[PDB]
From Swiss-Prot, chain A:
Disulfide-bonded cysteines: none
Parent-record interval covered: 754 to 803 of 1049
Oligomeric form and interacting partners: Homotrimer, with large domains that extend into the periplasm, interacts with AcrA and TolC. AcrA may be required to stably link this protein and TolC. Interacts with AcrZ. Part of the AcrA-AcrB-AcrZ-TolC efflux pump.
Protein name: Multidrug efflux pump subunit AcrB
Organism: Escherichia coli (strain K12)
Upregulating conditions: Positively regulated by MarA, Rob and SoxS transcriptional regulators (at protein level).
Functional summary from the UniProt entry: AcrA-AcrB-AcrZ-TolC is a drug efflux protein complex with broad substrate specificity that uses the proton motive force to export substrates.
Cell compartment(s), UniProt: Cell inner membrane
Deletion consequences: Loss of susceptibility to contact-dependent growth inhibition (CDI); inhibiting cells still contact the target.
Family classification: Belongs to the resistance-nodulation-cell division (RND) (TC 2.A.6) family.
Domain of life: Bacteria
Signal peptide: none
Curated annotation (Swiss-Prot), chain B:
Subcellular location, record wording: Cell inner membrane
Family per similarity comment: Belongs to the resistance-nodulation-cell division (RND) (TC 2.A.6) family.
Subunit structure: Homotrimer, with large domains that extend into the periplasm, interacts with AcrA and TolC. AcrA may be required to stably link this protein and TolC. Interacts with AcrZ. Part of the AcrA-AcrB-AcrZ-TolC efflux pump.
Phenotype of null mutants: Loss of susceptibility to contact-dependent growth inhibition (CDI); inhibiting cells still contact the target.
Functional note: AcrA-AcrB-AcrZ-TolC is a drug efflux protein complex with broad substrate specificity that uses the proton motive force to export substrates.
Name this protein carries in UniProt: Multidrug efflux pump subunit AcrB
GN (gene name): acrB
Classification of source organism: Bacteria, Pseudomonadati, Pseudomonadota, Gammaproteobacteria, Enterobacterales
Induction (free text): Positively regulated by MarA, Rob and SoxS transcriptional regulators (at protein level).
Shown residues in whole-protein numbering: 653 to 702 of 1049
Organism: Escherichia coli (strain K12)
Length: 50, 50
């Protein structure tokens, strides 16, 4: 929902920012919040509303 | 001259120029720059052709 630049790849020798964030559709209204779960340490897929 | 006859190891000698830190030979200095995508290799191609 906020980007996170990871590291740099290269374009045609010309060092370069790389960023992980959500496709557009799975971040626009706050109802989307729930698309997101999150492994916990039992392997359980936890979600947010939890 | 006594330093050619030596192997396959090129050994030169030479007197420093007048004013160490400065514009030696009446010679030229010529840098080939790159300009796009061309890579190391392509430039190496130009480099050589020229």
């Amino acid at each position: 929902w906020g980007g996170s630049y990871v590291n740099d790849f290269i374009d045609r020798g010309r060092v370069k920012k790389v960023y992980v964030m959500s496709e557009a559709k799975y971040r626009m209204l706050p109802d989307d919040i729930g698309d997101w779960y999150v492994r916990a340490a039992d392997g359980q897929m936890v979600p947010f509303s939890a | 001259r006594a330093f050619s006859q030596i192997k396959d190891a090129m050994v030169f000698a030479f007197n420093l120029p007048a004013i160490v830190e400065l514009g030696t030979a009446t010679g030229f200095d010529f840098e080939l720059i790159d300009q796009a995508g061309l890579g190391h290799e392509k430039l190496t191609q130009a480099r050589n052709q020229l």
